[PDB]
TrEMBL record, chain A:
Belongs to the 3-hydroxyacyl-CoA dehydrogenase family. In the central section; belongs to the 3-hydroxyacyl-CoA dehydrogenase family. This is Probable fatty oxidation protein FadB. CoA 5 binds at residues 171, 187, 190-191. CoA 2 binds at residues 73, 75-78, 123, 148, 182, 315. Residues 515-614 form the 3-hydroxyacyl-CoA dehydrogenase C-terminal domain. It holds the Pfam family 3HCDH_N. Pathway: Lipid metabolism; fatty acid beta-oxidation; Lipid metabolism; butanoate metabolism. The lineage of its organism: Bacteria, Bacillati, Actinomycetota, Actinomycetes, Mycobacteriales. It comes from Mycobacterium tuberculosis (strain ATCC 25618 / H37Rv). CoA 1 binds at residues 34, 73, 75-78, 182, 315. It catalyses: a (3S)-3-hydroxyacyl-CoA + NAD(+) = a 3-oxoacyl-CoA + NADH + H(+).
Length: 727, 402, 402
């Protein structure tokens, strides 16, 4: 009814008591290489906590260590994703039991030291936060934080309640909880997550026992007592009833709604609510409030979407799901880059930053120096003044050898072209070193719209030609869209798949088709907004609908960076592509809006005038002439219809890519839309959106096709669901 | 059934927030001072007939906590059977106390009731009582809390009221309030505050700046620019009002209501209680109404509340001689005027809170008695009093001169 | 004119102060939980007809500040035209909200009004709002402030109620409350409090001690002996009551009301609004009255307030079937019974605050709905509800079953 056990699993904790009376709980989950907060942990920790209370007369200190390479990494994702609202009681009881074990360990009357050897993430850090002293090994790769918000969850194992007690409402929320930021051992010591650092892992447990022997002699009265358990505790920054905090407290939910732009992501709201409500009551009552908010997220649909995408889908991508099965790992010596643009020169950055000895060449040495100049004044001018290992930029800069046409790319096993999107130019560019590089070399292409099959005809070894599409900026964008040509071998796809992982990026495999996946799907999002402007919808509403939907940038603003003249070139090329195939072309209503804007000379940010005004490299407000040009205000649909029209357009089109064979898995559709198209993370991807849709029609796939037919009956037959959805 | 009449309506002068004359006077004394004045006007008044004392107060904490209405009954030596109750409907608390008192009389279960308000903002600052709509993140996030000043700038942004438009009304309020004091319009209803020795503390509305010029108002800075930027409340308001691109911040310290101290008191009773106490009725409460509108802009409550009380009384906008809307912000009055198409000559004819200040809990009762005097001074019949309320509420009252 | 009828009357269970189940629930949630329950009973109810939400609250500060009634309207998704106002007449705030709502209906200017109260004493302790009657020395010295507990012992001293006499009533309250729960008297009106996930938080009045014995009550210590000695409040009370030699301190934790959390809500409207919304009237508000008595003993207000509402309705003590006086202290009920000579069988028939607790702002509305159920359960007609108030006030209400 009220214990350390949840109502026959394997034991995951090893007991060890020395002659001094110090107990060392070594966490070592046998089924797995990492300690996970699963059912085996709950029963094992329950037994160990019961034993700490039973032997409390012969125990003087506790040391919580780990036997894995890391410390402890979160909870069992496969169980939490199955939690339905009917299981709210079981979820509540489980996290109550976990916290009750930590609370007993915390109020044991004895100092408990956490020996953090590796990464302590999620529930792992919560276990260390229940201790009284935390020692971390200062080694790179040991992250510390509470990343539950990234999965649509909250730190429901005391993470919210304890960090707020340690740092206050504002500091714990902004720096730790709201974003789930991860810290290095030296950085966590700076803020105060861990208390002291050791050089090596071998000196961790002996230092933990040394601190207990010193804490018992120096501070015997306050031994094993947390600050919030002592009489006279004052929360940093005050309580909600303090006049200083209560003056700025009304701005906390408004600034959160400002950062989220009104997107329907419930986790940060629940974190802030639980943190402030917990700050008004005692610790145990605060812990219980945290449990009810946690149960509210896990049983919700948004947390299921993000766990599906940011855990299961992303793990399947890195597991080689789309990698050709049974292909060996071929080596890689030198890399040849042909591009000095914002995206071309950035490709040479991520490759040289991993040790590859790349050779950049872009026409004469003037553009090549400008291409190499993109890494210059940025490889260390805005990077050396950073965190750690700024004196190792030599191996990351001496590798890249920028030259011009004088160099013939001698002994290069990988070519990544990144010039202007021109067919005839791309043919002869690769033909300059077709027989000069290594006999077995990849011929990549960073194309966005041109079919990769036709580009392969410009080289003899077409089996090694393949599309390798990056995203600007290459140093900050993690998605790489690999486009498979008609004659692209699986060995080439495997070599490019392994390259993207060594870079640190996330690959997706795409078959050669019109617009591929990212460009084709993002076009329907932009086209839907332009169509609404032509219908008479206020431009301010269209931008707000895009922001509140979850997109990182509103669509009309995005239509200025993606130049309207470049959008018109895609429209005329798709027309000539389907008419020369025999069929008839049906223009999208967004085309007439584009043709009007280019007629007024407002082509976008490049010229300095588009849907917004621009002056001195800064974006101003919307152009006042839009309201009279497109009769803004004559059409006032519901804001949720504007949001759904933009979300369903990308949802129906990503389904067609799966039907047409452009994508081979919904994991590519979900991760590809999140990391390349800017699809809202709370949806879990453009494919997860159809199975996790929720609205006035209901929830699931049946409610999606019902809402789709409702949008189709009011905004055009393009919103009719495909036959693959079985309507 | 039984009609409700106003027999007396008095108030104190309004002392300003910074270096104010009333800062040394505790809020209870302001109410007791008005009770003593009501005793001077009717010494033969049998105070045992008074069954209730209803005071509105927006920050009922500290000096204003613990049911200050009951504290005023006991401190003033009123009979122990005179009740005493504090209420809070934000900025309309003063008028809500009047309406409740009139409705208690109209039910026949109460004969003679004292109603009013009190607010010492220099001693008990606004927001001292807390609240969930602002301090509780779950409800703040759900209701989309936006301060009243941000909603006032959004009203000017939506309706197209420029900085010069709101500063123009602000100048007019200073002028009409200055002409009202010079003409002796307020000599009979403003009761000078005195100390326990009888020495004068304050006898005039010291927040007024009678020498205000249109050029001097244009030199003032928008007092709510940093509130909207650092608080992100502009982004919140524009998520609800998505068709508005940017909020034009036009309200400053010269076109917004003043933060002042003050109290007001009205005496309401049935016709039977008036003749039994020898009291002559000054005006009759025609009808009261409570409505509301969107809480994000918060300040558009008076419009549906005014229409409802007009329908209850079976009247139109043309049937009312004087309109009195509290001048919380300039754009609120300009928007209320545009909503119902009211001539500028019959709207806040003696100036309002922009010049004389806005003592939250007392303002509703102050402007009510202000209209009682103007109906008798002009020999007009009907007047409508309404105020904008936090959370998007609205309260309106129609009175008829007797 | 228009009669006022009670259509619904619900309340939450009362959670105790120490290790209470409702300590984790903010006061706003208790009111929203009752609003949601009223929605379940009438899904076709047009909430736009609701013109007011009147909640009594004695400590309107922190979680209960900023007009919590309006916060409940917005947080529960009620229409923005539904008003929202907080009032404070101390311990009678819950019943005063009901009376005001009934009087608003009886004036014809309001059709359907929601009335109730809310008090989370475990989160917002009594006296957190301050007040002049206690914290201002001039008025404390003049009014001769004496805490309510000292006045309760003085009532037992004057009337000769012994320690065994008050402990006898305390035992009876535990018994009648235990029999009321076991008999299912409260199953239809006590709405269990649940969290946002639907999990149960509290479904019963956890302050009750059903296994109370007369021997166990005699073992308790007078909880107000140190208050009277260190505070000198006994000397103050005996200066006003000079013929009393010494105050007999008889009230302890077993014969005084409990400090608990809770909320209550009642729906009042005219007969026209009931037929228009398909609502069946449960009882009719016959008459309301507000009186008072000496504020030093403070707790003798119910007697003149009860006589006044009996004269207003033209009735006698014999015309009422059920008397419900809040059990603030045992001697208050014994004194009220001796004043009007009421049989013990018809006085607080289902137990009271001594067993189930006394949530200040909500108690008046809780015991009102308690009497609505007993009138329909017993098929009786009339019931009288009254409470003792701080400052010596008194409020009484008579209801008739329909
Ligand atoms: C608008 C507000 C912030 C101004 O506060 P403030 O800065 O203390 O106001 P002050 O008038 O004392 O100062 C403002 C400046 O404008 C000037 N000013 C104000 N009115 C002026 C006038 N008519 N002519 C010339 N100057 C004027 C002042 O002299 C001052 O300039 P200074 O500082 O150089 O002397 C404040 O009055 C307010 O918030 N209003 C209340 C509105 C409200 O929220 N009420 C309802 C609460 S529920
Ligand atoms: C009287 C009062 C001071 C008691 O507070 P308290 O000491 O916290 O009350 P508790 O009942 O928790 O504790 C009192 C003791 O009596 C015991 N007790 C109470 N009722 C009992 C019963 N029926 N049978 C047996 N023991 C009982 C308790 O168990 C406790 O003994 P313990 O401490 O050994 O456990 C408090 O209830 C009070 O002030 N009442 C409110 C009255 C009031 O002022 N209200 C209006 C405000 S405007």
């Amino acid at each position: 009814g009220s214990s350390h056990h949840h109502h026959m699993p394997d034991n995951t904790i090893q007991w060890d008591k020395d002659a001094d009376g110090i107990v060392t709980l070594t966490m070592d989950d046998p089924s797995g290489s990492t300690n996970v907060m699963n059912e085996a942990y709950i029963e094992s920790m329950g037994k160990a906590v019961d034993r700490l209370v039973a032997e409390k007369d012969s125990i003087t200190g506790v040391v919580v260590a780990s036997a894995k390479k890391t410390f402890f990494a979160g909870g069992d994702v496969k169980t939490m994703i199955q939690a339905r609202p009917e299981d709210a009681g079981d979820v509540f009881n489980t996290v109550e039991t976990i916290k009750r074990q930590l609370r007993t360990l915390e109020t044991l009357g004895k100092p408990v030291v956490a020996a953090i050897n590796g990464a302590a993430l999620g529930g792992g850090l919560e276990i260390a936060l229940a201790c009284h002293h935390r020692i971390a090994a200062d080694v790179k790769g040991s992250q510390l934080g509470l990343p539950e918000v990234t999965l649509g969850l909250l730190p429901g194992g005391g993470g919210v309640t304890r960090t707020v007690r340690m740092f206050g409402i504002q500091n714990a929320f902004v720096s730790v909880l709201a974003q789930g930021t991860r810290f290095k051992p030296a950085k966590a010591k700076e803020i105060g997550l861990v208390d002291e650092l050791v050089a090596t892992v071998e000196e961790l447990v002996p230092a933990a026992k040394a601190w207990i022997k010193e804490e018992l002699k120096a501070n015997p009265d306050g031994a094993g007592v947390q600050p919030w358990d002592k009489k006279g505790y004052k929360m940093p920054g005050g309580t909600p009833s303090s006049p200083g905090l209560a003056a700025i407290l009304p701005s906390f939910p408004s600034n959160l709604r400002k950062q989220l732009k009104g997107a329907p992501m419930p986790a940060p709201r629940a974190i802030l609510a639980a943190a402030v409500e917990g700050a008004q009551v005692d610790f145990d009552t605060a812990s219980r409030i945290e449990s009810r908010y946690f149960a509210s997220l896990v049983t919700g649909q948004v947390a299921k979407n993000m766990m599906q995408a940011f855990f299961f889908d992303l793990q399947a991508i890195n597991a080689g799901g789309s990698r050709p099965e049974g292909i060996g790992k071929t080596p890689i010596k030198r890399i040849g880059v042909l591009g000095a643009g914002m995206m071309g020169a950035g490709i040479a950055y991520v490759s040289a930053k991993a040790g590859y000895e790349v050779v950049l060449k872009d026409v004469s040495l003037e553009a090549a120096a400008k291409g190499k100049g993109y890494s210059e004044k940025l490889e260390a001018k805005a990077l050396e003044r950073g965190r750690t290992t700024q004196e190792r930029s030599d191996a990351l800069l001496a590798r890249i050898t920028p030259t011009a046409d004088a160099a013939d790319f001698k002994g290069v096993d990988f070519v990544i072209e990144a010039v202007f999107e021109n067919q005839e130019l791309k043919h002869k560019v690769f033909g300059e070193i077709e027989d000069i590089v290594e006999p077995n070399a990849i011929l990549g292409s960073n194309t966005s719209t041109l079919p990769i099959t036709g580009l392969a005809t410009g080289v003899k070894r077409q089996e090694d030609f393949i599309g390798i599409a990056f995203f600007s900026p290459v140093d900050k964008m993690p998605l790489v869209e690999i486009i498979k040509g008609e004659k692209t071998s699986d060995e080439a796809l495997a070599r490019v798949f392994d390259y993207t992982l060594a870079i640190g990026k996330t690959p997706i495999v795409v078959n050669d088709s019109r617009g591929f996946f990212t460009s084709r799907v993002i076009g329907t999002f932009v086209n839907e907004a332009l169509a609404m402007l032509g219908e008479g919808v206020e431009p301010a509403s269209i931008e707000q609908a895009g922001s509140q939907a979850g997109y990182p940038a509103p669509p009309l603003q995005l239509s200025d960076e993606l130049n309207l003249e470049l959008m018109h070139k895609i429209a005329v090329a798709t027309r000539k592509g389907v008419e020369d195939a025999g069929g008839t072309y049906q223009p999208h209503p967004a085309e007439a809006v584009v043709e009007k804007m280019i007629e007024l000379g407002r082509s976008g940010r490049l010229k300095g005038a588009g849907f917004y005004e621009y002056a001195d490299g800064k974006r101003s407000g919307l152009w006042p002439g839009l309201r009279e040009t497109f009769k803004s205000g004559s059409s006032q649909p519901p804001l949720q219809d504007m949001i759904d029209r933009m979300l369903f357009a990308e949802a129906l089109e990503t389904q067609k890519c799966l039907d047409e064979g452009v994508l081979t898995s919904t994991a590519d559709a979900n991760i590809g839309s999140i990391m390349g198209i800017g699809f809202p993370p709370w949806t879990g991807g453009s494919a997860q959106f159809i199975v996790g849709y929720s609205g006035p029609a209901g929830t699931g796939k049946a409610a999606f096709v019902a809402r789709a037919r409702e949008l189709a009956a009011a905004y055009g037959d393009r919103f009719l669901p495909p036959e693959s959805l079985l309507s | 059934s039984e009609e409700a009449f106003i027999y007396e309506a008095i108030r104190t002068p309004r002392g300003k927030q910074k270096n104010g004359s009333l800062h040394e006077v505790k809020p209870l004394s302001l109410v007791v001072g008005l009770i003593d004045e009501l005793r001077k006007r009717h010494p033969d008044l049998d105070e045992n007939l008074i069954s209730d004392v209803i005071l509105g107060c927006v920050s009922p904490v500290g000096d204003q906590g613990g049911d200050i209405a009951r504290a005023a009954v006991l401190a003033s030596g009123m009979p122990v059977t005179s009740g005493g109750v504090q209420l809070n409907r934000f900025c309309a608390s003063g008028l809500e106390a009047v309406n409740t008192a009139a409705q208690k009389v109209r039910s026949g279960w109460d004969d003679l009731v004292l109603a009013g308000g009190v607010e010492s903002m220099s001693r008990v600052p606004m927001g001292s009582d807390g609240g969930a709509m602002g301090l509780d993140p779950a409800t703040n996030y759900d209701v989309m809390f936006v301060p009243q000043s941000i909603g006032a700038d959004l009203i000017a942004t939506i309706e197209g009221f420029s900085r010069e438009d709101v500063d123009a009304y602000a100048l007019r309020s200073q002028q009409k309030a200055a002409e009202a004091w010079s003409g002796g319009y307020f000599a009979k209803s403003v009761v000078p505050v005195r100390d326990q020795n009888g020495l004068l503390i304050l006898d005039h509305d010291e927040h007024m700046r009678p020498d205000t010029t249109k050029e001097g108002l244009a030199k003032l800075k928008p007092a709510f620019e940093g509130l909207a930027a650092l608080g992100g409340f502009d982004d919140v308001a524009l998520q609800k009002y998505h068709w508005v691109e940017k909020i034009n911040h036009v309200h400053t310290g010269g076109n917004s209501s003043g933060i002042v101290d003050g109290a007001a008191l009205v005496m309401i009773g049935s016709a039977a209680a008036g003749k039994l106490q020898g009291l002559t009725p000054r005006a009759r409460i025609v009808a009261t109404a409570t409505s509301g509108a969107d809480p994000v802009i918060m300040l558009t409550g008076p419009t549906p509340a005014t229409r409802k009380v007009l329908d209850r009384a079976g009247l139109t906008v043309d049937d009312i001689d004087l309109f009195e809307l509290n001048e919380a912000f300039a754009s609120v009055v300009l928007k209320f005027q545009k909503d119902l198409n009211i001539p500028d000559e019959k709207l806040n004819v003696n100036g309002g809170a922009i010049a004389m200040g806005h003592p939250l809990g007392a303002t509703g009762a102050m402007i009510l008695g202000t209209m009682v005097d103007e109906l008798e001074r002009r020999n007009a019949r009907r007047a409508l009093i309404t105020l904008c309320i936090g959370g998007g509420m609205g309260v309106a009252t129609i009175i008829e001169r007797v």
